[PDB]
Design a protein around this ligand. Structure first.
Ligand SMILES: [Mg+2]
Ligand SMILES: [Mg+2]
Ligand SMILES: [Mg+2]
Ligand SMILES: [Mg+2]
Ligand SMILES: [Mg+2]
Ligand SMILES: [Mg+2]
Ligand SMILES: [Mg+2]
Ligand SMILES: [Mg+2]
Ligand SMILES: [Mg+2]
Ligand SMILES: [Mg+2]
Ligand SMILES: [Mg+2]
Ligand SMILES: [Mg+2]
Ligand SMILES: [Mg+2]
Ligand SMILES: [Mg+2]
Ligand SMILES: [Mg+2]
Ligand SMILES: [Mg+2]
Ligand SMILES: [Mg+2]
Ligand SMILES: [Mg+2]
Ligand SMILES: [Mg+2]
Ligand SMILES: [Mg+2]
Ligand SMILES: [Mg+2]
Ligand SMILES: [Mg+2]
Ligand SMILES: [Mg+2]
Ligand SMILES: [Mg+2]
Ligand SMILES: [Mg+2]
Ligand SMILES: [Mg+2]
Ligand SMILES: [Mg+2]
Ligand SMILES: [Mg+2]
Lengths: 138, 124
RNA sequence: UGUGGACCCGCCCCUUGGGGUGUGUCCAAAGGGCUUUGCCCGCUUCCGGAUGGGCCCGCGUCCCAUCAGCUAGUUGGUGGGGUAAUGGCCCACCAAGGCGACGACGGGUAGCCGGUCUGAGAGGAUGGCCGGCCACAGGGGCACUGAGACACGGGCCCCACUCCUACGGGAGGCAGCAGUUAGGAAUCUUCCGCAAUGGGCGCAAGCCUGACGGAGCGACGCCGCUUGGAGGAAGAAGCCCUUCGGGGUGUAAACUCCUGAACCCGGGACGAAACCCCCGACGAGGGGACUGACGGUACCGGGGUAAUAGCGCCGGCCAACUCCGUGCCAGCAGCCGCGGUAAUACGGAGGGCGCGAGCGUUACCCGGAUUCACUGGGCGUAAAGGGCGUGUAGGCGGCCUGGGGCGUCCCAUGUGAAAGACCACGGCUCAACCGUGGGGGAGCGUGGGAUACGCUCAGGCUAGACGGUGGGAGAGGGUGGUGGAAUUCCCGGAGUAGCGGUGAAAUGCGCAGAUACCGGGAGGAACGCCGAGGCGAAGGCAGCCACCUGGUCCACCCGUGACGCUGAGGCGCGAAAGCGUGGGGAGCAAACCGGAUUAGAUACCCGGGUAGUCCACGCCCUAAACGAUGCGCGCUAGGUCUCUGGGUCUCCUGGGGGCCGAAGCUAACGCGUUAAGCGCGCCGCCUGGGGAGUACGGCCGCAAGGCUGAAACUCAAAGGAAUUGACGGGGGCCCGCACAAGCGGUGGAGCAUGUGG
RNA sequence: GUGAAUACGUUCCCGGGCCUUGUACACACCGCCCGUCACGCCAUGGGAGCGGGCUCUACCCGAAGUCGCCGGGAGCCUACGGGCAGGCGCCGAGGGUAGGGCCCGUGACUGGGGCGAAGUCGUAACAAGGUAGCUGUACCGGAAGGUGCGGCUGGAUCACCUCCUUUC
RNA sequence: AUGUUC
């Protein structure tokens, strides 16, 4: 019945990106969208749109890749090189503002749920708030 | 393990084994030679190796290597035991400290003199 | 006397026994000194302060579950007792509770913390010194006195031990400072002084203070300093190597200058200004006097001598190599391993490297060890998936809206003592050490705030899950029956000389007529073809028929509305063998008897043969119980064969079973929409090999045995996968006088000759 | 000089080549290796028992001390309602006796275990290891082991099957 | 058919 729908969403992204899919579908939640809002805003995904497979709400996510490459193996570089759930139903992870992580030394982003919404590490730090470490991306 | 398993049973902290009941965890131990005798090493090596069975203050009788070319240990010689085994004599977990109690130094020794309990020779 | 206070009761307020108030009762006291109608010290009661405490509560606080049940003042109540005070603290009475897998109880270990050591951190280890808390004072109980003690140098008793004794009795408690003795690898002066700071008593003078301040001893530790500095040869001697020219020690020395640790001379501290005395008032404020253990020390000035250096290592890790001696000896050794006559690994020399008043060793802790893995590991074959279901606790929980604000985050604030750590500036000539100031710091309390996520309550949805209707395939299970083939045996017939059996034989069966053939019958076991796939959670399930019965798939999209996943324990199922009571017994067949084979043959081959194999009931509970792969869910190319549903059916769509493969994973082999990929949940399990699935204990079992499951000791590996070989009483293909086909010899005889002896 | 025989064939013997296969060999099958038995050393389990430590249960005796009742036909004080002595009792350190639990030590002897350069017997395993192996179980045998039943492939040379796959 | 060892 899906233990962790967020994890499942991140995993749908990683699985799709590793086979260079144009887009992928994920059963919809408001929370899922708010995560995607950010992925988009930070440029890991082209963006998303609500849709309706067989009478039911999904979020179709539009994946983004690098240029095709030279040499044996011309597969594009990933924009999303790495996307990893931190907090999870079996071990929830919470961090206040002063111990938010710096992910891949600035070139990455962490994402968290806060009392002011879903923010990145930079948003949160500048807002002065902590929250649940949903996941990290780079 | 899942984190819940780790909560429930946790991880077993290592725990580890003395090579050396010089009881107490003393660094040394007084004993008396019970028997002084020679023994033969384990397969690869061949020698007439010098060991003393030693009855200890620590309550334990154990064997102990007598390092150095030549020695002066006999049946009631008092001895300082040291710890350190010998990859070659099975069940010899200890050395005798030359230069102490009844263990003489090693005569003519000139190089590694402070092991082997040998006084700095006179350069007359 | 009663300012006041205590107590019962009533009243008001307050809200656990807090504050007030009324009447009743009940409760105080101590004097001493002076320069004396005034001062100083004391005495009594009450109120408030400050300081120090007691008791209580939340949370945190090691190892064993081979410790799983614990508990009688035990849990609670009522009324007492007790105390400063709550309280089963203690006691009567009543009730029957209380605690425990969120680990009670028990056993083992341990004082706890600030800190400390290690570590990148998270962690790990530790808790000596200094600070804080606790406990103890020869062992055990006990109270007294008191503001306080159940009292370290107070008391009682018991016990242990010692001492004096005139034998009547007495005395004692260093875990205070020193010291002795014993134990030990090992740890100091029976030091100086109260000058300082602090403490007790006193109006004060002052007394006391092994607290303390100092000195001493110990390289035990850290910091600092010295053993010279500058010059000085293409380079003495000695000693080592040598290719007999040299090369090395080495600018090292000798030698010239220079400086001047120690020494000796002179001077000489800070730390000490108070208390006290006088003016003032015995206040503030001003003035005076005493006082130094350390110490004739630190330090300053003046003279002034070239003045201790050692320890470890030089095979690799690891920085640093030659000669001799030695010859698996002597010896080295942390691991790999060195040593067998040219050893950079033994011992010595020279030479070198590394540290240096030290250098090594042993012990122990952290590191390295992502080798208990939170950070940060794993289980197909390396150690590791539980034999499989069912399911309890527990863990985890789809989509939407609202309320709450416990988690969570934010802000403020309190707390987080000092010392230590960290930053800055300062004091000792530096540093160590020390001062002063500064920033931190999780935790936790309080107030305020946020609501994304987690939780919770409320409502909602239908994608998960269950259900209805309709269809289906199936060795899924159970009970009853009954069908043919075959084997055996019995009764017959017919027929006659062997059958059987092996590599070959024999045992055995057979003239009391076997074998082969036919008829009659019995009885047991298993179901040929179909037949490869199918069913089941696993084990496992195969003739046909009937009854009973479980799982499962599909379709309609009809009902419920998250009802879900997993699952420590528990319950049930669990091949074969095996066990118990019965039955049954054809074939087979452990053991066993015979025959062979063999060096032996307690085996393999042959002839027999008992349990057993079969059935009922009851046990046992294991396994290569295997896919050596836990369950559930989602996600990530396809191709092809196949089982079984559905389909405006040349293909689509679901559920299973196979093979090949995308991406990806994997040590590799391999796996790959039936994952070993990508992820979330939950369970189980691993932590080198042997010892050992052993011992001990405990549980289960009628027994066999099962489950749970160590350590000593031992080894430096055990091991997975793949690679190159080599090998095979493995395969294919192929060769040579290899065999085979031939012809002639050797082995016998004499002798020649080489050899063993 | 004189001067033959014979070769079907490659199954077998000795040696060898190429591919393949299994391997626990690699000093490479003149390899490895298993168990009894024999010897030595080490550490252990069991063992008639013996000896401690701790602990629990019941019963008996019970010091000090607080506390409670009495203090009378009873002494001493008095501040005579009282106090003190004195007496009884509870609890009680400990001690005694009996039986359990746990832990330690030790024990004639004894089971197996590990280690011991070249012990005896056979040859179980590794190559179809010469009877594929392994496995739970059961019986038997100096010893490995054998044999029964069932399982596993971590075996099978074949074969022919079906699948995959590559045809061209 | 069997057929050990170094
Ligand atoms: Mg040496
Ligand atoms: Mg009360
Ligand atoms: Mg009191
Ligand atoms: Mg202790
Ligand atoms: Mg580390
Ligand atoms: Mg004492
Ligand atoms: Mg004393
Ligand atoms: Mg001594
Ligand atoms: Mg670690
Ligand atoms: Mg590992
Ligand atoms: Mg294995
Ligand atoms: Mg394994
Ligand atoms: Mg399984
Ligand atoms: Mg539940
Ligand atoms: Mg609801
Ligand atoms: Mg519906
Ligand atoms: Mg069974
Ligand atoms: Mg059976
Ligand atoms: Mg039976
Ligand atoms: Mg039997
Ligand atoms: Mg037979
Ligand atoms: Mg297993
Ligand atoms: Mg595949
Ligand atoms: Mg047992
Ligand atoms: Mg021939
Ligand atoms: Mg002849
Ligand atoms: Mg071959
Ligand atoms: Mg047999």
């Amino acid at each position: 019945m899906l233990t962790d729908p967020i994890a499942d969403m991140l995993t749908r992204i990683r699985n799709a990106t590793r086979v260079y899919k144009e887009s992928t579908d994920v059963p919809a939640s408001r929370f899922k969208e708010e995560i995607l809002r950010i992925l988009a805003r930070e440029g890991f995904i082209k963006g998303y749109e609500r849709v309706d497979v067989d009478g039911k709400p999904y979020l179709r996510v539009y994946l983004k890749y690098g240029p095709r490459r030279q040499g044996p193996d011309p597969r594009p570089e990933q924009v999303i090189h790495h996307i990893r759930r931190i907090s999870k139903p079996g071990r929830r992870v919470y961090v206040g503002v002063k111990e938010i992580p710096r992910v891949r030394r600035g070139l990455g982003i962490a994402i968290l749920s806060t009392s002011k919404g879903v923010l990145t590490d930079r948003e949160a730090r500048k807002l002065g708030v902590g929250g649940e470490l949903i996941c990290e991306v780079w | 393990p899942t984190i819940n398993q780790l909560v429930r049973k946790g991880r077993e902290k290592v725990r580890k084994k003395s090579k050396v009941p010089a009881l107490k965890g003393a660094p040394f131990r007084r004993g008396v030679c019970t028997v002084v005798r020679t023994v033969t090493p384990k397969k690869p090596n061949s020698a007439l190796r010098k060991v003393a069975k030693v009855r200890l203050t620590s309550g334990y009788e154990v064997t102990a290597y007598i390092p150095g070319e030549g020695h002066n240990l006999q049946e009631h010689s008092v001895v300082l035991i040291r710890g350190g085994r010998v990859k070659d004599l099975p069940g010899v977990r200890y050395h005798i400290v030359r230069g102490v109690y009844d263990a003489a130094g090693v005569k003519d020794r000139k190089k590694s003199r402070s092991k082997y309990g040998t006084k700095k020779p006179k350069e007359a």
